[PDB]
Short mmCIF file of all heavy atoms in Angstrom, two decimals:
data_model
loop_
_atom_site.label_atom_id
_atom_site.label_comp_id
_atom_site.label_asym_id
_atom_site.label_seq_id
_atom_site.Cartn_x
_atom_site.Cartn_y
_atom_site.Cartn_z
N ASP A 8 -1.27 22.76 -0.54
CA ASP A 8 -1.32 24.00 -1.39
C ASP A 8 -0.61 25.16 -0.60
O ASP A 8 -0.64 25.15 0.55
CB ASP A 8 -2.78 24.34 -1.71
CG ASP A 8 -2.82 25.34 -2.78
OD1 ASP A 8 -1.68 25.96 -3.16
OD2 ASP A 8 -3.98 25.79 -3.23
N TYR A 14 2.74 32.09 -11.65
CA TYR A 14 1.84 31.30 -12.46
C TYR A 14 2.57 29.97 -12.88
O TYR A 14 1.97 29.00 -12.99
CB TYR A 14 1.43 32.02 -13.70
CG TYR A 14 0.36 33.02 -13.43
CD1 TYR A 14 0.63 34.25 -12.94
CD2 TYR A 14 -1.03 32.73 -13.76
CE1 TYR A 14 -0.32 35.13 -12.67
CE2 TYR A 14 -2.00 33.67 -13.50
CZ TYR A 14 -1.71 34.84 -12.91
OH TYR A 14 -2.65 35.77 -12.77
N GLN A 18 1.02 26.10 -12.84
CA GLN A 18 1.22 25.35 -14.01
C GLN A 18 1.95 24.05 -13.77
O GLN A 18 1.64 22.95 -14.27
CB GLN A 18 1.89 26.22 -15.04
CG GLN A 18 2.53 25.44 -16.12
CD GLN A 18 1.51 24.73 -17.16
OE1 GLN A 18 0.58 25.50 -17.58
NE2 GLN A 18 1.84 23.49 -17.47
N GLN A 21 0.04 21.38 -11.90
CA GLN A 21 -1.00 20.91 -12.84
C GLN A 21 -0.35 19.77 -13.80
O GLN A 21 -0.83 18.75 -14.00
CB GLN A 21 -1.71 21.96 -13.50
CG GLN A 21 -2.70 21.45 -14.48
CD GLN A 21 -3.13 22.54 -15.47
OE1 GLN A 21 -4.21 22.43 -16.12
NE2 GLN A 21 -2.31 23.56 -15.52
N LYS A 79 -11.67 21.87 -15.22
CA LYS A 79 -10.93 21.97 -14.00
C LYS A 79 -10.50 23.41 -13.77
O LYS A 79 -10.46 23.92 -12.65
CB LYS A 79 -9.77 20.94 -13.88
CG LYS A 79 -8.90 21.03 -12.70
CD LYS A 79 -9.56 20.56 -11.48
CE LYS A 79 -8.50 20.18 -10.42
NZ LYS A 79 -9.01 19.66 -9.17
N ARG A 80 -10.06 24.08 -14.78
CA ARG A 80 -9.60 25.51 -14.79
C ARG A 80 -10.71 26.39 -14.56
O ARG A 80 -10.59 27.28 -13.87
CB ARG A 80 -8.83 25.80 -16.01
CG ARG A 80 -8.63 27.30 -16.21
CD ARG A 80 -7.61 27.45 -17.41
NE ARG A 80 -8.16 27.00 -18.55
CZ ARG A 80 -7.47 26.36 -19.49
NH1 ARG A 80 -6.22 26.10 -19.25
NH2 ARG A 80 -8.02 25.87 -20.67
N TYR A 83 -11.54 27.55 -11.12
CA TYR A 83 -10.44 28.18 -10.41
C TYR A 83 -10.86 29.00 -9.16
O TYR A 83 -10.34 28.70 -8.06
CB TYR A 83 -9.54 29.13 -11.29
CG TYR A 83 -8.34 29.54 -10.53
CD1 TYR A 83 -7.51 28.60 -9.84
CD2 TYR A 83 -7.94 30.82 -10.59
CE1 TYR A 83 -6.43 28.92 -9.21
CE2 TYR A 83 -6.63 31.20 -9.94
CZ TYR A 83 -5.99 30.25 -9.23
OH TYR A 83 -4.85 30.68 -8.62
N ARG A 85 -13.39 29.61 -6.38
CA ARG A 85 -14.58 29.29 -5.58
C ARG A 85 -15.23 30.49 -4.94
O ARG A 85 -14.52 31.40 -4.44
CB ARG A 85 -14.24 28.20 -4.53
CG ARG A 85 -13.73 28.81 -3.17
CD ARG A 85 -13.86 27.80 -2.07
NE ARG A 85 -13.63 28.35 -0.78
CZ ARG A 85 -14.43 29.11 -0.11
NH1 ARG A 85 -15.60 29.51 -0.64
NH2 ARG A 85 -14.06 29.61 1.03
P A B 83 -14.37 42.67 -19.17
OP1 A B 83 -12.96 42.37 -19.37
OP2 A B 83 -15.38 42.23 -19.92
"O5'" A B 83 -14.54 42.01 -17.69
"C5'" A B 83 -14.56 40.54 -17.65
"C4'" A B 83 -13.33 40.09 -16.83
"O4'" A B 83 -13.54 40.28 -15.38
"C3'" A B 83 -12.96 38.62 -17.04
"O3'" A B 83 -12.26 38.42 -18.08
"C2'" A B 83 -12.23 38.30 -15.76
"O2'" A B 83 -10.88 38.68 -15.82
"C1'" A B 83 -12.90 39.25 -14.83
N9 A B 83 -13.87 38.49 -13.87
C8 A B 83 -15.23 38.96 -13.63
N7 A B 83 -15.90 38.11 -12.84
C5 A B 83 -14.95 37.03 -12.66
C6 A B 83 -14.99 35.86 -11.84
N6 A B 83 -16.11 35.41 -11.23
N1 A B 83 -13.91 35.01 -11.77
C2 A B 83 -12.82 35.55 -12.48
N3 A B 83 -12.70 36.60 -13.20
C4 A B 83 -13.75 37.37 -13.30
P U B 85 -7.91 32.93 -18.26
OP1 U B 85 -7.40 33.31 -19.54
OP2 U B 85 -9.48 32.83 -18.06
"O5'" U B 85 -7.20 31.60 -17.81
"C5'" U B 85 -5.89 31.65 -17.01
"C4'" U B 85 -4.77 31.10 -17.78
"O4'" U B 85 -3.99 32.11 -18.27
"C3'" U B 85 -3.99 29.98 -17.14
"O3'" U B 85 -3.48 29.07 -18.07
"C2'" U B 85 -2.82 30.95 -16.62
"O2'" U B 85 -1.62 30.14 -16.40
"C1'" U B 85 -2.65 31.90 -17.69
N1 U B 85 -2.15 33.28 -17.22
C2 U B 85 -0.91 33.61 -17.45
O2 U B 85 -0.01 32.78 -17.93
N3 U B 85 -0.50 34.85 -17.03
C4 U B 85 -1.33 35.72 -16.47
O4 U B 85 -0.85 36.82 -16.10
C5 U B 85 -2.70 35.36 -16.37
C6 U B 85 -3.07 34.19 -16.75
P U B 86 -3.32 27.54 -17.64
OP1 U B 86 -1.80 27.17 -17.69
OP2 U B 86 -4.22 26.76 -18.56
"O5'" U B 86 -3.77 27.35 -16.20
"C5'" U B 86 -2.98 26.79 -15.26
"C4'" U B 86 -3.54 26.90 -13.81
"O4'" U B 86 -3.37 28.23 -13.29
"C3'" U B 86 -4.95 26.52 -13.53
"O3'" U B 86 -5.20 25.15 -13.50
"C2'" U B 86 -5.14 27.23 -12.23
"O2'" U B 86 -4.60 26.48 -11.16
"C1'" U B 86 -4.25 28.49 -12.35
N1 U B 86 -5.03 29.73 -12.81
C2 U B 86 -4.56 30.99 -12.54
O2 U B 86 -3.44 31.15 -12.14
N3 U B 86 -5.37 31.97 -13.03
C4 U B 86 -6.50 31.91 -13.58
O4 U B 86 -7.31 32.94 -13.94
C5 U B 86 -7.17 30.65 -13.73
C6 U B 86 -6.42 29.56 -13.35
P C B 87 -6.38 24.46 -12.59
OP1 C B 87 -6.48 23.18 -13.10
OP2 C B 87 -7.52 25.53 -12.47
"O5'" C B 87 -5.60 24.39 -11.18
"C5'" C B 87 -6.33 24.23 -10.01
"C4'" C B 87 -5.57 24.52 -8.83
"O4'" C B 87 -5.89 25.88 -8.37
"C3'" C B 87 -5.96 23.67 -7.60
"O3'" C B 87 -5.33 22.40 -7.65
"C2'" C B 87 -5.31 24.52 -6.54
"O2'" C B 87 -3.99 24.44 -6.37
"C1'" C B 87 -5.85 25.88 -6.94
N1 C B 87 -7.25 26.20 -6.43
C2 C B 87 -7.35 26.58 -5.22
O2 C B 87 -6.39 26.61 -4.37
N3 C B 87 -8.62 26.90 -4.70
C4 C B 87 -9.71 26.79 -5.46
N4 C B 87 -10.91 27.05 -4.98
C5 C B 87 -9.52 26.40 -6.85
C6 C B 87 -8.40 26.12 -7.23
P G B 88 -6.20 21.15 -7.11
OP1 G B 88 -5.59 19.86 -7.58
OP2 G B 88 -7.63 21.40 -7.38
"O5'" G B 88 -6.10 21.18 -5.58
"C5'" G B 88 -4.80 21.36 -4.89
"C4'" G B 88 -4.94 21.94 -3.51
"O4'" G B 88 -5.79 23.22 -3.63
"C3'" G B 88 -5.70 21.14 -2.53
"O3'" G B 88 -4.98 20.08 -1.88
"C2'" G B 88 -6.13 22.23 -1.44
"O2'" G B 88 -5.00 22.46 -0.64
"C1'" G B 88 -6.41 23.40 -2.43
N9 G B 88 -7.90 23.57 -2.54
C8 G B 88 -8.62 23.23 -3.62
N7 G B 88 -9.98 23.48 -3.54
C5 G B 88 -9.93 24.16 -2.22
C6 G B 88 -10.99 24.63 -1.47
O6 G B 88 -12.16 24.76 -1.85
N1 G B 88 -10.66 25.19 -0.32
C2 G B 88 -9.23 25.14 0.20
N2 G B 88 -9.14 25.81 1.39
N3 G B 88 -8.34 24.62 -0.52
C4 G B 88 -8.76 24.17 -1.70
P U B 89 -5.74 19.05 -0.98
OP1 U B 89 -4.96 17.80 -0.96
OP2 U B 89 -7.10 18.96 -1.33
"O5'" U B 89 -5.60 19.75 0.38
"C5'" U B 89 -6.47 19.53 1.49
"C4'" U B 89 -6.68 20.61 2.42
"O4'" U B 89 -7.45 21.74 1.71
"C3'" U B 89 -7.44 20.38 3.65
"O3'" U B 89 -6.66 19.89 4.73
"C2'" U B 89 -7.93 21.83 3.99
"O2'" U B 89 -7.09 22.53 4.71
"C1'" U B 89 -8.24 22.40 2.75
N1 U B 89 -9.65 22.45 2.19
C2 U B 89 -10.64 23.09 2.89
O2 U B 89 -10.36 23.71 3.91
N3 U B 89 -11.85 23.02 2.47
C4 U B 89 -12.28 22.31 1.30
O4 U B 89 -13.52 22.44 1.01
C5 U B 89 -11.27 21.71 0.56
C6 U B 89 -10.02 21.65 1.11
P G B 90 -6.90 18.39 5.26
OP1 G B 90 -5.85 18.14 6.24
OP2 G B 90 -7.17 17.51 4.15
"O5'" G B 90 -8.21 18.61 6.14
"C5'" G B 90 -8.20 19.42 7.26
"C4'" G B 90 -9.70 19.70 7.74
"O4'" G B 90 -10.26 20.75 6.87
"C3'" G B 90 -10.65 18.51 7.64
"O3'" G B 90 -10.53 17.67 8.74
"C2'" G B 90 -12.04 19.28 7.62
"O2'" G B 90 -12.40 19.69 9.00
"C1'" G B 90 -11.71 20.55 6.83
N9 G B 90 -12.19 20.47 5.41
C8 G B 90 -11.34 20.17 4.29
N7 G B 90 -12.11 20.08 3.22
C5 G B 90 -13.37 20.23 3.65
C6 G B 90 -14.65 20.23 2.98
O6 G B 90 -14.91 20.03 1.74
N1 G B 90 -15.69 20.49 3.86
C2 G B 90 -15.66 20.69 5.18
N2 G B 90 -16.72 20.81 5.90
N3 G B 90 -14.45 20.66 5.83
C4 G B 90 -13.43 20.39 5.01
#
Side-chain angles (χ1 to χ4, degrees):
Chain A
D8 190 356
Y14 283 78
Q18 157 74 44
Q21 182 199 188
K79 177 73 160 177
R80 166 169 65 218
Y83 191 42
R85 83 165 189 73

